[PDB]
Amino acid sequence: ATNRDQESSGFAWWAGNARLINLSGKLLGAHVAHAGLIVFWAGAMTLFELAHFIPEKPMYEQGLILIPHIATLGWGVGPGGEVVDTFPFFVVGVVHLISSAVLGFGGVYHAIRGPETLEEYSSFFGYDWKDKNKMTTILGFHLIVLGIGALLLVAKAMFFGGLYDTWAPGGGDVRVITNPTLDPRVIFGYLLKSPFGGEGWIVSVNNLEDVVGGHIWIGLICIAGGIWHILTTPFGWARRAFIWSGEAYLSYSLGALSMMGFIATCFVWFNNTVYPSEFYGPTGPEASQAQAMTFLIRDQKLGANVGSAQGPTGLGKYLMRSPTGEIIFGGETMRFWDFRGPWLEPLRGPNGLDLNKIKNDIQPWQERRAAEYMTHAPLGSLNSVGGVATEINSVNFVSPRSWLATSHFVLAFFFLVGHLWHAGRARAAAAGFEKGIDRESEPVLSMPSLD
Amino acid sequence: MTILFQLALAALVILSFVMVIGVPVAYASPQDWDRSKQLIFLGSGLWIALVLVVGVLNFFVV
Amino acid sequence: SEGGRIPLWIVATVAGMGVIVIVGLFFYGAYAGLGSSL
Amino acid sequence: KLPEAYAIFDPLVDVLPVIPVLFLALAFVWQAAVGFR
């Protein structure tokens, strides 16, 4: 039992995994088994969702988060996101669940039976954290792998059925992407967009051509970068900038993951393109706007002239101007005027919401959709009672957008905390005082008084 | 075919349970590692075969 | 009789499982019968 | 729902997602067995 107590390893049981830092075989084991756990959850959770799935209720009324991910890719769904075949969901679930067995088998093997260290066994699979070239090489393999992944998304979109497109002419539907956006001004133009209202950085991506082209760029970039890191070793400036240790690299990755988590939170909250409202429910903005729409429709049917209706504050009861003059829905939803969705856009002209189109061209499907979305707003309790906080029990509903956003904020935050922890520790340990101050060499004691 | 399916699938579940308990016990057991190792090869191979059998039979029962 | 025969880790595991079961029952009870809102 | 052929496994399918959590608790059973050394 090499290194499996505090006295020999220096780490207590509650930090026991830190005993693995220089044990590449067992560490490989931990990693592979963990990957196994992830894939296991994907499979099992998918089969659970499918078992509980009623094809004629919206997905979002049923607590689904993975089936929406599958349906977004174009599998199992048809016009307007209606389920036409549940078999691909079944396939996805079963295949992940079976793969998890292979992964776990490997993980357990390397973890308790295989070589505890790999260096003596193989120069190729062996590594020293402090070997910069080897680090950049493994990094490179993994970048090529990620690039390939992005390219698989591309291949699905272009050659194997396409993607679900909430924006398809005539109504949302599955669509093959034939002309992906390759122009770098567009692609990287997203990257330089402000993250504030009406701009929204990369979260603002609103068409699949841009999504797909973006993935072509990321695929090539990752493969190229992978090759670069396989062929090179870090330059002097990098060498002097970073800490080179396992715990350091881990901390860097924790920072990256935290950042990505906050990003995904905002994506699932605001974006209704790669997270179609057909599957995930309406966004908060969307449902608010939809309320406005619903009452405009009702009151106008009653005979109200909604363009000239002055509300109690002096602002339009139904319609008002944005700070730059565009015609928008009034009331509190004035905040959500940057919202865009296929059910609303046919009412939009060059200056914003168009009064003539409003008076003359609103179709029954728009009324239906606005009602649906208004009454599936992402508000609800921890015990999944749908609606505002004061609503009575009756409707069993918490929006998938809320589950995903909240979960990923919690995770992203704790991951920032973890970054601080491991970065600070990595610094202290590399400098040699992570276990405390040397009584015979206390740095402050050799410093001049502050006063 | 349906009965063959049902039996193959039950077989796969049972065998999986057997492997889930036995593989980590064998890996960490001091004595009798040779017979265990052989048995782990046998079990893994049979497991794969059963996955493929259920996979194929799926399309003749659903 | 003498302390030791039943290993402490097993006692902790069984006791813990028991705790999990009872609390589980209570959470089930939140969805069925009295207090369920139904 | 799962395809009819698999329906008999519904209770099993209901339980599977929680299995990962069982791995975390198993770390603690294991550690208790070696006295948290």
């Binding site: - | 889930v20 960490a28 057991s29 | - | 339980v15």
Partner: peptide, 29 residues
């Protein structure tokens, strides 16, 4: 109902059973 509980019973016992078997066999815990 009893089915789900039965499943979680065997599945749930699986883990502690492994530790127990190795503890009895003086295995490499």
């Amino acid at each position: 109902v009893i089915a789900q509980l039965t499943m979680i019973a065997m599945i749930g016992i699986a883990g502690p059973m492994i530790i127990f078997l190795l503890a009895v066999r003086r295995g490499n815990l």
